[PDB]
Design a protein around this ligand. Structure first.
Ligand SMILES: [Mg+2]
Lengths: 62, 63, 126, 55, 76, 119, 189, 62
RNA sequence: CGAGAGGUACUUUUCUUUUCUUUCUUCUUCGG
């Protein structure tokens, strides 16, 4: 943006063109396109992590 | 039949280009070739004679 | 005991480098016998430049008092291998457990070597 | 599940936690996991000025 | 009895399976066993020593058959 | 068995000669004229190569010679290719500038037989 | 490779036979000792994996990483056959111990009556001794003239423990060496 | 469709000399070159996309 | 007991020597 003033528009960041599960993956343009599609879709929903800050008002199956 | 089906599962199911086809579809069209109808294509393949090679570049001129 | 003794001098290296971390197939033409030689020498352990001379002995034993399987300790590059091909301007084909040798010379200098025999390789850089 | 005494240990005494095969890298074509590891290593080791660091 | 002169593996695996079921049902072994309790180890020795009274009715596709013997056949 | 005898196809124009195409044919006869190298390359490729005058490098040169001697008749050049020049001359030549080599054929023996006579 | 799967979460279900007539004919026609020839192309069914293939390539193409006596006698504990001659008496004027080449370590898996010849990689085996090899592949992989197919054509009675001993000894040697992927392999300069 | 079919094959044989640069610049102790020459996992086409350039990217669908 | 959903599950599965050509401007051959 700095040297040519022929644009009249600019983006905030180039990494904001992806989803919330894909823009948090580091080096996402370095990996293969088939391998980031696994992590951003299937491996992000099956990864055990945080559940809830209140497990007393939650009676979910699992 | 097992030796053909094992080559049928371990084959590329994606076409190479728009003119050619996949190696799986090429095996399917060869194995299922007794449909006795379809698409009215009827591709032929003609050859050249032996006496056309007596001239300089005779095969290219004949073809 | 020794059936071959000559004074070799090298002329060519196959990688022709310093720190290739591989084996180097040398090319050594000999004086007063007109004999060519191929040999894989570990340069990183036993250094060999291009231009230096070295002797070479080839004895089937080492203890120099008979007993075919006190020792010869006047050399620095003692190896051991087998001769598997005498397919001849004769030429030998000796493999020292993976390192190949090709002793190609006149047919009268190399005639006492039999087939599928165990022989050593003695070398010293003068 | 290997014991701690059988792992290849670093000179600082740091044993690895999860050992993966090198053969999974040329087939799956995943570079950037090694880059993430080299970045997170350089973050966590001390410098013998921690500001202006590539985080 | 002029078909193959050699015992196939498919008939051998059935002869041994019949002999193991016979020995497992407390039958007298025709071969002298020397320190063995598995019926398959007795059945393989009986097959290799040719001391078993079985006959193979090798059926033909035309409708007839050729009744063979185990001792007439050979095992490699 | 003999070789072929029919040459290249003739080139017929759709108009008459305007006395400039003869000038172009005379000037372009100097270039693309490899008639001086075919008989030399055949004589060296028969000396250096066994089964002489029957290998493929002799048959292509024998075809190129028959195509090059018709260059005055029809307008088809020879086009001597690369990887066919010998780059080494035998003993029975007067080329004392090229890196020559001792000929082992009958031509080297006939060249040495006159040096044995003029001694 | 017969199962055409990997350790990936991929399940593998088994069937337990109950009668003895199904148990006798199970290890006589269906077991791995009977499924030695690949029925599709006539070659061998089992071959080397990836770690064993890489450690068999690296033990043959290096030819400069020599082993001593204490490493050779440690690696011989997984090999079925005996110890060869050392073939390196002195590699240096300061060498105080006989060393062992890499191709003599791979030659301890072959029987003494085994002969093998691959002309594309200059592989010459004579009297159970790997004598020559120079910058070649596909003689250790699956092919028409690999050494596993010739070992199956040789005896076909004691090859299932030769492949197991090779997978043990090459995994010990590759652990003694160490295979890794760093950023210098990605940089390629 | 035919001009792309005669150009994919014209790129894939001229890329064989571009793929031949991993043996000049790469060392003999490279793990990808070892795993590609051994035939265990991968080839030189994976190493070229890893290090130098991805190359031709085309699809067979219109 | 049937329907609807999401999930595990085909991973590279066939690129070939990595040594292939630029040191170029060089006698046409026979007989009058
Ligand atoms: Mg899996």
């Amino acid at each position: 943006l700095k040297e040519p003033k022929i644009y009249t528009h600019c983006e905030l960041d180039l990494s904001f063109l992806l989803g919330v599960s894909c823009a948090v993956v580091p080096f996402a343009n370095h990996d293969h396109g088939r391998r980031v599609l696994y992590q951003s879709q299937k491996h992000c929903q099956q990864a055990i992590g945080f559940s809830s800050t209140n497990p007393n008002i939650r009676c979910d199956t699992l | 039949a097992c030796a053909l089906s094992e080559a049928a599962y371990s084959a590329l199911d994606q076409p190479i280009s728009l003119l050619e086809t996949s190696p799986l579809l090429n095996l399917k069209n060869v194995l299922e070739c007794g449909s006795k109808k379809g698409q009215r294509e009827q591709t032929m393949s003609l050859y050249l004679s032996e006496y056309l090679s007596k001239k300089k570049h005779g095969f290219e001129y004949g073809s | 005991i020794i059936m071959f003794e000559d004074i070799f001098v090298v002329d060519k290296l196959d990688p022709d480098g310093k720190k290739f971390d591989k084996v180097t197939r040398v090319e050594a033409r000999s004086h007063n016998l007109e004999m060519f030689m191929h040999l894989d020498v570990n340069t990183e352990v036993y250094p060999l430049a291009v231009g230096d001379k070295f002797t070479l002995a080839m004895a089937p034993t080492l203890n120099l008092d008979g007993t075919p399987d006190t020792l010869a300790d006047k050399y620095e590059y003692i190896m051991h291998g087998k001769l598997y091909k005498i397919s001849e301007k004769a030429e030998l084909y000796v493999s020292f457990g993976g390192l190949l040798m090709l002793l190609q010379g006149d047919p009268a200098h190399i005639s006492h070597f039999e087939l599928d025999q165990r022989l050593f390789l003695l070398m010293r850089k003068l | 599940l290997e014991e701690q005494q059988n792992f290849p240990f670093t000179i600082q005494g740091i044993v690895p936690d999860i050992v993966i095969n090198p053969h999974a890298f040329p087939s799956r074509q995943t570079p950037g996991q090694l880059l993430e590891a080299a970045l997170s290593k350089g973050i966590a080791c001390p410098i013998q000025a921690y500001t202006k660091l590539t985080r | 009895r002029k078909t193959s002169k050699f015992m196939t593996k498919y008939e051998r695996a059935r002869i041994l399976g019949t002999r193991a079921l016979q020995i497992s049902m407390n039958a007298p072994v025709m071969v002298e066993l020397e320190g063995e309790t598995d019926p398959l180890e007795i059945a393989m020795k009986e097959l290799r020593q040719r001391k078993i009274p079985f006959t193979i009715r090798r059926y033909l596709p035309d409708g007839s058959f050729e009744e063979w013997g185990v001792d007439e056949l050979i095992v490699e | 068995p003999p070789m072929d005898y029919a040459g290249s196809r003739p080139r017929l124009m759709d108009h008459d000669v305007t006395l400039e195409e003869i000038h172009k044919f005379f000037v372009d006869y100097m270039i693309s004229d490899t008639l001086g190298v075919i008989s030399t390359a055949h004589l060296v490729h028969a000396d250096r190569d066994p089964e002489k005058a029957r290998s493929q490098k002799c048959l292509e040169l024998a075809n190129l010679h028959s195509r090059a001697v018709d260059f005055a008749k029809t307008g088809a050049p020879a086009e001597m290719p690369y990887a066919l020049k010998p780059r080494e001359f035998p003993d029975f030549l007067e080329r004392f500038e090229k890196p020559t080599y001792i000929s082992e054929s009958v031509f080297g023996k006939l060249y040495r037989a006159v040096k044995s006579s003029l001694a | 490779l017969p199962f055409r799967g990997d350790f990936d979460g991929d399940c593998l279900h088994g069937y337990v036979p109950q009668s003895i007539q199904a148990k006798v004919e199970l290890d006589e026609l269906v077991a791995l000792d009977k499924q030695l020839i690949n029925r599709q192309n006539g070659r061998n069914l089992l071959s080397l994996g990836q770690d064993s293939l890489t450690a068999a390539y690296l033990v043959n193409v290096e030819k400069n990483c020599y082993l001593n006596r204490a490493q050779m006698q440690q690696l011989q504990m997984y090999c079925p056959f005996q110890l060869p001659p050392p073939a390196i008496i002195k590699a240096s004027p300061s060498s105080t111990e006989p060393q062992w080449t890499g191709m003599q370590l791979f030659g301890m898996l072959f029987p003494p009556g085994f002969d093998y010849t691959y002309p594309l990689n200059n592989v010459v085996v004579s009297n159970g001794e790997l004598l020559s090899f120079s910058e070649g592949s596909a003689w250790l992989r699956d092919g028409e003239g690999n050494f596993i197919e010739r070992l199956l054509k040789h005896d076909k009675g004691k090859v299932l423990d030769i492949i197991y001993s090779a997978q043990e000894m090459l995994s010990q040697w590759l652990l003694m060496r160490g295979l890794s992927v760093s950023l210098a392999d990605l940089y390629l300069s | 469709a035919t001009l792309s079919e005669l150009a994919v094959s014209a790129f894939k044989d001229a890329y064989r000399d571009v793929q031949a640069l991993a043996y000049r610049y790469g060392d003999q102790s490279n793990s990808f070159l070892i795993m590609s020459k051994a035939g265990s996992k991968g080839n030189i086409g994976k190493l070229v996309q890893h290090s130098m350039c991805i190359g031709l990217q085309n699809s067979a669908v219109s």
